[PDB]
Structure 1
Amino acid sequence: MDPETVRIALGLEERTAAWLTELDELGPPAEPVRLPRGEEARDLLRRLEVPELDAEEIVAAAPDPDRDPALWWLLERTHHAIVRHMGDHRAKPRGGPPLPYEGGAAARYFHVYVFLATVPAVRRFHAERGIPDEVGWETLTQLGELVAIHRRKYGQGGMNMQAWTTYHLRGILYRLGRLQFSLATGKDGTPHLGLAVPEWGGPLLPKAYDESLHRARPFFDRHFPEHGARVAWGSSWMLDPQLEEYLTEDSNIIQLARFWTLTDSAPEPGNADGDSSILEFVFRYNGQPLDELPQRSSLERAVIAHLKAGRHWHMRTGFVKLP
């Protein structure tokens, strides 16, 4: 198959053509793609904390090379595009486009199949690096979270955070307790660790935050001694000082953000670019009228009140020195 046939068959937009050309030139992987199927797939999906409903649906719809040749072509090459950058934190997180849901469950769960096909490769990388098994598995369990989020957000099964899962699948992100850390470099090449906060695992209790920070240097200095980061960086809705108007002192976000040194300029008050981030993480927002959104927590109320007052939320960037 040629990439135009694939684009057309899958319903992908014209601006994906360059990506499909790139994948065409890359070609199939040296090790052919194997999807686990049946109970093997159920066992793997359960280990990845994929909810039972979604897992049953993923196994049932697992695509076939003969019956799904366009989708299969894309699966093979997308897998290859990830594994060619195993351990490479300088490569951009290009997981490929989402497939139109007119392709059914196979299209909806396309990037779950990518993930499942790439588990063996990343687990081999974990092993080569001396990563403890419990750490490697705990890292990959964010698949289950992301699957659960899609259903909460859109009402059916899926997983459309494939750009994010390229980090996990390239062996460049590790969950070390409550927080995740990624190998990263600044514009001047200086190593840092990118810090992120998965949804699952409960509130960001100061003791859980502090413990994760204490694990970072030891972990990366042992398994990735070539990196040698001394600071963690973050870009988040959570680092917006405007939250202090609305959240009390007992807020975990307020308490933890006080340790951070913000490095970006105070944003323009009219800049609305950060609104979508906070709406995603607080509401899994999907274009609904704002007065329909829940108001059970102080943050939910705060996000809506601030927007209703004609004001805007901003993602801010900063750092903390690693213990």
Structure 2
Amino acid sequence: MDPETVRIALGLEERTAAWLTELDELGPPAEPVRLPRGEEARDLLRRLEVPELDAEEIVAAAPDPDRDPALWWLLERTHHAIVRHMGDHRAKPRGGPPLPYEGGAAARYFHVYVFLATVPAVRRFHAERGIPDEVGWETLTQLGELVAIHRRKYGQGGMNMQWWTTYHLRGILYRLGRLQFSLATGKDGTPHLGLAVPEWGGPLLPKAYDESLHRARPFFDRHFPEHGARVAWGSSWMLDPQLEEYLTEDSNIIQLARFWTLTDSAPEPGNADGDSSILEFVFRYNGQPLDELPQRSSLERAVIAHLKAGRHWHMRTGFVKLP
């Protein structure tokens, strides 16, 4: 098969051609790609907290080298494009494009098969780094969350956050309790830990947040001693001080943001960029008119009211020193 044939078969837009060329030149992986099937697959999916409805569909639609040659070609190389950067946080998070849904369930769950095919390689990396099994598994369970998110957002099964799962799959991000931390560097190359907050796991209770922060240095200083971060860095709608207008004192976001030192400039009031971020995380927004959006929580009302007033939300960036 050739990249141009793949592109046309899968219905991929012309801009993907460069990627497909990169993948063609990269070639298949040394260790041949293996998808778990049947009950082996169900057990893996279950361990990764994929909801039963989706898991059953993923197993049913698993593609085949003979019937799905264009998809299979892309699966091998996309897997390869990820493992070649195992442990490497300096490489960009390129998970490859989403596949048009005209290709059906195998196309919708394409990046789930990528994830499944890549579990053995990342678990090997975990073991070499001496990462505890429970931490390695807990990290990889975000697959289930991201699958569940696709279904809530769009209404059918899928997983279109493959750029994000390149972090888990390269062994550069670890869930350490309520929070996740990634091996990262600033523009000047100084090491730090990138912080992220998975959806699943309940409210961001101060005690839970604190425990995660305490886990960060001991974990990375043990398993990634060459890294040596002292500080965690976050960019988020959650760090926007404008939230203080609308959320009360018992807001976990408000209490915790107080510990952060913001390092970016006060944004231009007319900069509408952070809007799509807050809309994604609060509503899993998908173009529907603001009036139709739910208004059950104080934050849900806040996001809309602020927007209705002609105002904008901003992603803000800051740091906390690691305990």
TM tier, smaller: over 0.9
Task: Identify the residue that residue 56 of structure 2 maps to in structure 1.
Answer: 56
Q: TM-score, normalised by structure 1?
A: 1.00
Measure the CA separation in 2 of the matches of 1:21 and 1:50. 32
Measure the CA separation in 2 of the matches of 1:13 and 1:266. 38
State the secondary structure of the residue aligned to 1:165.
helix
Cα distance, 1:50 vs structure 2: 0.1
Q: Which runs of 4+ in 1 moved over 6 A?
A: none
Task: Identify the residue that residue 148 of structure 2 maps to in structure 1.
Answer: 148
Measure the CA separation in 1 of the matches of 2:92 and 2:63. 27
Cα distance, 1:67 vs structure 2: 0.3
**Residue deviations 1:113-135, cap 9 Å, x none?**
00000000000000000000000
How big is the alpha-carbon RMSD for the aligned residues of Structure 1 and Structure 2?
A: 0.3
Cα distance, 1:257 vs structure 2: 0.2
State the secondary structure of the residue aligned to 1:204.
coil
Task: Identify the residue that residue 82 of structure 2 maps to in structure 1.
Answer: 82
Measure the CA separation in 2 of the matches of 1:267 and 1:246. 19
State the secondary structure of the residue aligned to 2:269.
coil
Cα distance, 1:296 vs structure 2: 0.3
**Residue deviations 1:187-245, cap 9 Å, x none?**
11100000000000000000000000000000000000000000000000100000000
Cα distance, 1:173 vs structure 2: 0.1
State the secondary structure of the residue aligned to 2:180.
strand
State the secondary structure of the residue aligned to 2:163.
helix
Q: TM-score, normalised by structure 2?
A: 1.00
| Percent of residue pairs bearing the same amino acid type | 100
Cα distance, 1:110 vs structure 2: 0.1
Task: Identify the residue that residue 219 of structure 2 maps to in structure 1.
Answer: 219
Measure the CA separation in 2 of the matches of 1:243 and 1:311. 12
Measure the CA separation in 1 of the matches of 2:18 and 2:280. 29
Measure the CA separation in 2 of the matches of 1:82 and 1:125. 13
Measure the CA separation in 1 of the matches of 2:107 and 2:263. 40
Mapping for residues 125-204 of structure 1, pairs under 5 Å:
125-204=125-204
Provide structure 2 residue ranges, at least 5 long, that are not aligned to the other structure. Answer: none
Measure the CA separation in 2 of the matches of 1:290 and 1:172. 37
Measure the CA separation in 1 of the matches of 2:261 and 2:286. 32
State the secondary structure of the residue aligned to 1:184.
strand
Cα distance, 1:292 vs structure 2: 0.4
Equivalent residue pairs, number: 323
Measure the CA separation in 2 of the matches of 1:7 and 1:239. 40
Cα distance, 1:287 vs structure 2: 0.3
Cα distance, 1:158 vs structure 2: 0.2
Measure the CA separation in 1 of the matches of 2:112 and 2:315. 29
Measure the CA separation in 2 of the matches of 1:264 and 1:110. 37
Cα distance, 1:176 vs structure 2: 0.1
Measure the CA separation in 1 of the matches of 2:258 and 2:233. 14
State the secondary structure of the residue aligned to 2:204.
coil
Cα distance, 1:111 vs structure 2: 0.1
Cα distance, 1:154 vs structure 2: 0.2
Cα distance, 1:70 vs structure 2: 0.3
State the secondary structure of the residue aligned to 1:318.
strand
Cα distance, 1:63 vs structure 2: 0.1
Task: Identify the residue that residue 313 of structure 1 maps to in structure 2.
Answer: 313
State the secondary structure of the residue aligned to 1:235.
strand
Provide structure 1 residue ranges, at least 5 long, that are not aligned to the other structure. Answer: none
Measure the CA separation in 1 of the matches of 2:190 and 2:119. 30
State the secondary structure of the residue aligned to 2:103.
helix
Task: Identify the residue that residue 116 of structure 1 maps to in structure 2.
Answer: 116
Measure the CA separation in 2 of the matches of 1:255 and 1:286. 30
Cα distance, 1:74 vs structure 2: 0.3
